[PDB]
């Protein structure tokens, strides 16, 4: 149903911000719940954030964040550009990882990388100091 491709990764310095994009092709990203995950070189793939497809207010879609990033990361939705973004602020070396976005069609499962329908290729983010 959807193809996802992340982009925006690169080498950044600690303390900087980076904005990642998860662009869909083949379908509209507007009817899929989108989630962000990242995986450090030898660690397990961990959940970062999810953004619903339903408006909660005029300009805000439902949104959830994992404890390790709540307050520093912000996920946003642009259906018009078939893109969901992940704004990452005050980066630390511990944020170095390959970042992935995934898509599912239900609200359930919650925060496990186990039950997502479609996955991106991953984009590398390296935070040095």
Q: Provide DSSP, the chain.
A: --EEEEE---EEETT--EEEEEEEESS-GGGSEEEEEEE-TTS--EEEEEEEEEEEETTEEEEEE-TTTBTTEEEEEEGGGTEEEEEE-S--GGG-EEEEEEEESSS-S-S-STT-SEE---EEEEEE-
Q: Could you tell me the sign of the dihedral formed by the alpha carbons of 48, 112, 54, 123, in that order? A: positive
Work out the burial of residue 91: count CB atoms within 10 Å of its CB; fewer than 13 is exposed, 13-18 middle, 19 or more buried: buried
Tell me if 116 sits within 8 A of 2, measured CB to CB: no
Declared resolution, Å: 2.0
Structural domain count, the chain:
1
What CATH number is given to the structural domain containing 105?
2.60.40.10
Cα separation, 115 vs 93, whole angstroms: 29
Boundaries of domain holding 51: 1-129
């Amino acid at each position: 149903q959807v193809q996802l491709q992340e982009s925006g990764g690169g080498l950044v310095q600690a303390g900087d911000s980076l904005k990642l994009s998860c662009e869909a092709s083949g379908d509209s990203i507007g009817t899929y719940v989108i989630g962000w995950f990242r995986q450090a070189p030898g660690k397990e793939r961990i959940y970062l954030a999810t953004i619903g497809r339903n408006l909660v207010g005029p300009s805000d879609f439902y949104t959830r964040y994992a404890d390790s990033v709540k307050g520093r990361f912000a996920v946003s939705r642009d259906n018009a550009k078939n893109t969901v973004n992940l704004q990452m602020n005050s980066l630390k070396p511990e944020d170095t990882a390959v970042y992935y976005c995934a898509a599912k069609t239900t609200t359930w499962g919650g925060n496990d990388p186990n039950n997502w329908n479609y996955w991106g290729q991953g984009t590398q983010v390296t935070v040095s100091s």
